[PDB]
Amino acid sequence: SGWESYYKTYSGRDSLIFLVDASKAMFESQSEDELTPFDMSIQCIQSVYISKIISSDRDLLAVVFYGTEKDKNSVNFKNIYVLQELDNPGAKRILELDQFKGQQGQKRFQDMMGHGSDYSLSEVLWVCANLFSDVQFKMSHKRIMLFTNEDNPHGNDSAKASRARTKAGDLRDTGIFLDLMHLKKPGGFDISLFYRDIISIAEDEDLRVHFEESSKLEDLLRKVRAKETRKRALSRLKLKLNKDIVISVGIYNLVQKALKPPPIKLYRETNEPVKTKTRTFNTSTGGLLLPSDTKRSQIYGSRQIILEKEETEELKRFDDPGLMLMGFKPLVLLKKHHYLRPSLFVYPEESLVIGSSTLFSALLIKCLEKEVAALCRYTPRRNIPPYFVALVPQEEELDDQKIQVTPPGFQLVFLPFADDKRKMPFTEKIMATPEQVGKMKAIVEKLRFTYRSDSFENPVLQQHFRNLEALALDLMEPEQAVDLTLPKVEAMNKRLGSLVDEFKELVYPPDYNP
Amino acid sequence: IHWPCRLTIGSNLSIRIAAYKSILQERVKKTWTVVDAKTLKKEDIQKETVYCLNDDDETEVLKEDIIQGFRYGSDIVPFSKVDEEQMKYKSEGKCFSVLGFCKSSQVQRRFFMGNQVLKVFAARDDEAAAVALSSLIHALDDLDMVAIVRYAYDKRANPQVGVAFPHIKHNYECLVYVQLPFMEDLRQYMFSSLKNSKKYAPTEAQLNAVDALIDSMSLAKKDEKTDTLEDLFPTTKIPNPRFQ
């Protein structure tokens, strides 16, 4: 029909830059028994530095000051001082920032950088963009947090305000997210006056006049001590409903033991890392011996059985790695007490195999409807004995805030073998009278509490992190973390006024010494 | 072997208890020894570890000039073993205390941690502990609540927080304890929902086919319509094939 129908028509690392005003307005404090706004900015910066050091040390942080007599930057823009360029956080940077922490630190700031100098925002945004461009690592996020207590710094010039507005728009277009941590101001801080055109995202209720310091300061000051790991698939296995039917799936660990960072060996004199090397040589020949020339041997009552390394690996070979599906088992037969290993999470991939997501979704829907779990043999990697596991469907759940709390997919639970179970000694069944059960029920009800998955903290890891931080920053003493795991028996005793004594009298004979 | 301790609700009530490892991963008890091919003696083969600095001359460093250290974000923080022991988090060993009681539905099995399950009974001889533990188990079962306990094998062992829940059978009853995760262990992963994915929406025929497959591949059967499920493939009663 002519020329009519034949023609138609998670990665990288996070970064952050601290922008701190150097005007005299930031230094004055309202009355005594209060901390000056610049001190609050420094405290927040230090807390963020520590939190980044612990949670994710691969991120990049930078500190830039403006409104100072001195200047320093790769472009020589006046009144701009890049105290710390974008680099991985370290104890040295925190110690350097600690210089300005005290009042003598404030005097050092005044003497070494000055204050009260005029400035233009466009210059600050230019230096920030240059700092972002300088680094070479992939940039998952780019954030600029401006610490200031001024509403409209260019209250007398419109050209400067227009330049700042256009530069803020350009940076927002480039993919830079800007936030403002407004601090104390005697009169009152309002964001709609000048910063309405600069902030990348405006909250639902932010145009009102703000009197108290920014709420985000409290969150920033809240130090977090817990290693953070980005989403990553442990393995990309191949579920096999049949020799021909196959779908690629990804395996993740939603719960993983948090071990303390591994230690290393340092040379005492110079205090630098040393290298570890191991080797094996014949006691007689005294020459380098490779694994090939060695053999594996086992002794059983004056008899030695010897096999090659390849033979030893072959011993455990049963089938290729993956999930070989079998029939479906009712969820009732999955006993709660039959727990062997932490459960894993199985999710669709759709990358290795196209069309697996729809089949996985249908299986999940019908398994939830029928309340069954897919029993399957599992082989995480080559040369590993198979293990029987059960895939129980997981229904997606979300809270009132519409934030995911239980991702959809399959929960893989390892089913113990016959030899995994252990025999137990005979115990005579003794039944308690109903009155004892009632008293203990009263105690249990009196000691009720709501349990959350993250209601407790690992005391060992927290203490280790606090000790390491104290030594790195040369703190006088390490803060003693409160052990939430302790039973806090004082409140327990207070709640159980006389229940314990009554229960003991009812159930414990007079002659008994626990 | 039984592990004896005391379940302590507070500072006044204490029940003598014994715990056994009900479930534990089974591994090979015999290791593999390395021997030379030409001569079948393990004496000839030996392992030597050599430590050297990152220098051209590769100076060897004695075992007595090495200090334990940790990384603090591109900065190295020396931390001696003696200092670690002095500042190590001390704890009272052999402790089994109840922090509180929470609804069973709150604790989900997907959060279970550790590599063992404990079964706790009363002490071997005394009957007072037996009746006390029976009363506690019955109360928990009736109220459908589970205790959040603190477990510590010994002073050296790191303390952990676990869930103890009742287990009542026709001939014996006990408390089943399984470790629970700390806030550090939890992983916050975001996965796109599949229900609302238009491109991942199976049709009615696909759902019917999946349902037919599930029905045809059932590993459980009805025992003469007597309301008693029968397991056709009881994987829990199959010995580990690796040992055989």
Partner: peptide, 24 residues
Amino acid sequence: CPGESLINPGFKSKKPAGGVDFDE
């Protein structure tokens, strides 16, 4: 996105562990 930690973007902010809090 609401409820997102300001320290590590893309991760869910979590309140400090409150330990045991007995109810009324």
